[PDB]
């Protein structure tokens, strides 16, 4: 019946503390490695689940939203498909995670449509930066069917813009440019003095000016005449709707401006006829300062770097170069683990192939005789041979077209093929394959 007193210290420091822990570590944060929040990890994980069969078939977002609870998801699917709608932009994101098919909006509109018109599939850039995913660190919860995280060669958290918001903490990161971060991970691999990558925005002709830990994103404007006006770019936090509603309309119902549209292949083209009772400054620097004060073309942004590490704990940073270097020193350990484990399996494969090839060379008029004798006799007599110690199940699952001469030379050449693959993956190390998977862009 349990009429128990549950006191408020117990209520807060157990239940609300666990709720706060879920917000800070399993709802809001992306890791420094993959750049994915856990609902994003769910989205790309079920994108890999539906990526089998063809890499060019297009799939419904609701088809991801259907069986996401198989992987360990226990919330509403609408937030998941709207998250995938954000990674279906390629205008709010510099790095295209998924190829898409449908109406995805532009710079001028920001609200994505519902799932009912939208097809999506895995992009190639996934396959450029994510590889070797069977070595991913398996999560501590058993029904957490995706791992802890995946294997990128890059920190993707700095490529598309992260706003991470939870109980207590908050974080914000701007996107960057692909060649800048590519030469950055070259220079951080080599151990030289690492250069800062350039912050890039997609589909955007504005200018990012970096002063005192401060990003001035500047929209563009041009004086076509003295009075007539053409703003061609607006800053990135504004779209066409709020530039109309909070800038163009409040100055339009004050008798100073009359705005109109002049867009095209680029959006945000507003042609503004100023009115005769509004003062045009002949001092052009005062004109520039007042047009920055009123039209608000300079958007100033300050970043915030708080991250969960590879160990599952909070870490506060101030520079992006330290995130690159931490990514490199974290990643190289698992690269070396992959190298050693790959050596183990490639050897097991070579001894398996040499065992089955030398088996077939001892079958064709050989001492291993199959007719007239039962199953158990052959399993025991091949089990007593040490070079058929634990392989005899796939020797017996083998079929009779492994009897001719051509297959015997085929088994021999494939055994020496994985022998030279065994030696080739035995010689190499972290750095030259990391150089290779970097240069596969």
């Amino acid at each position: 019946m349990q009429l128990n007193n549950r006191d408020l210290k117990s209520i807060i420091d157990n239940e609300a503390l666990a709720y706060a822990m879920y917000t800070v570590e399993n709802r809001a944060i992306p890791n420094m490695i993959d750049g994915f929040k856990p609902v994003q990890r769910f989205v790309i994980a079920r994108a890999l689940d539906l990526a089998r069969g063809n890499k060019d078939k297009f799939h419904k977002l609701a088809s991801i939203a259907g069986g996401v609870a198989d992987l360990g998801y226990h919330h509403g699917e609408n937030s998941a498909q709207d998250a995938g709608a954000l990674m279906a932009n390629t205008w709010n994101n510099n790095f295209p995670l998924l190829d898409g098919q449908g109406n995805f909006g532009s710079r001028t509109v920001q609200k994505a449509a519902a799932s009912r018109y939208i097809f999506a599939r895995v992009s190639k850039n996934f396959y450029n930066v994510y590889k070797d995913t069977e070595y991913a660190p398996v999560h501590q919860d058993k029904e957490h069917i995706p791992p802890a995280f995946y294997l990128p060669i890059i920190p993707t958290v700095l490529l598309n813009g992260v706003s991470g918001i939870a109980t207590g903490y908050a974080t914000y990161i701007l996107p960057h440019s692909v060649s800048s971060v590519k030469k950055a991970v070259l220079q951080a691999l080599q151990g030289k003095k690492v250069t800062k990558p350039k912050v890039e925005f997609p589909e955007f002709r504005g200018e990012v000016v970096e002063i005192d830990g401060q990003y001035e994103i500047r929209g563009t404007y041009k004086f076509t005449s003295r009075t007539q006006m053409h703003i061609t770019e607006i800053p990135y936090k504004y779209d066409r709707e709020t530039y109309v509603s909070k800038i163009l309309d409040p100055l339009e119902n004050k008798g100073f401006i009359t705005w109109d549209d002049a867009c095209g292949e680029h959006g945000f083209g507003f042609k503004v006829k100023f009115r005769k009772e509004y003062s045009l400054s002949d001092n052009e620097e005062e004109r520039h300062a007042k047009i920055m004060k009123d039209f608000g073309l300079i958007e100033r942004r300050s970043q915030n770097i708080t991250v969960i590490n590879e160990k599952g704990k909070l870490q506060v940073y101030d520079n992006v170069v330290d995130l690159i270097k931490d990514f490199v020193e974290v990643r190289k350990t698992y690269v070396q683990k992959r190298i050693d484990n790959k050596i183990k399996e490639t050897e097991s494969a070579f001894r398996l192939a040499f065992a089955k090839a030398h088996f077939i060379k001892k079958v064709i008029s050989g001492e291993i005789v199959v007719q007239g004798k039962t199953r158990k006799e052959l399993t025991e007599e091949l089990s007593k041979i040490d070079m058929y110690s634990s392989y005899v199940d796939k020797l017996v699952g083998m079929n009779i077209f492994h009897m001719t001469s051509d297959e015997a030379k085929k088994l021999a050449e494939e055994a020496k093929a994985k022998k030279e693959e065994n030696e080739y993956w035995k010689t190499t190390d972290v750095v030259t394959e990391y150089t290779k998977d970097l240069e596969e862009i």
Binding site: F58, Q101, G102, N103, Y117, I118, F119
Partner: protein, 116 residues
């Protein structure tokens, strides 16, 4: 949906003013319902019967049905707006009996109207 329900109901709405019909200022935009990849190129089909008449003659393909503009891409929209296709909507002299036959609340008009 569109060309069968919001089309004739808004034409019955517009039937109070025929002067814009003989001004020719009403222009229906014919929109594709199937975009099909054949070889490398694409083919457009406006209605389902246009596809079904030419389904057997066209070779193996990969189609995409179009439910509306939310499935249409950027370049497809810019092609159908910078090279548009219009049906000029002309009212006949017997528009009133057609709109009563097709928009009146009697179901029997819809009964022997479909029986021919």
């Amino acid at each position: 949906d569109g060309l069968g329900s919001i089309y004739p109901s808004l034409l019955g709405f517009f039937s109070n003013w025929p002067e814009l019909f003989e001004q020719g200022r009403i222009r229906f935009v014919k929109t594709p319902v199937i975009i099909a990849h054949v070889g490398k190129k694409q083919e457009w089909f406006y209605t389902v019967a246009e596809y079904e008449s030419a389904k057997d003659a066209l070779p193996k393909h990969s189609i995409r049905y179009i439910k509306g503009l939310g499935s249409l891409e950027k370049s497809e929209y810019r092609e159908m707006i910078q090279n548009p296709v219009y049906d000029v909507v002309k009212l006949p002299e017997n528009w009133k009996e057609l709109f009563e036959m097709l928009m009146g609340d009697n179901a029997d008009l819809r009964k022997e109207w479909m029986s021919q």
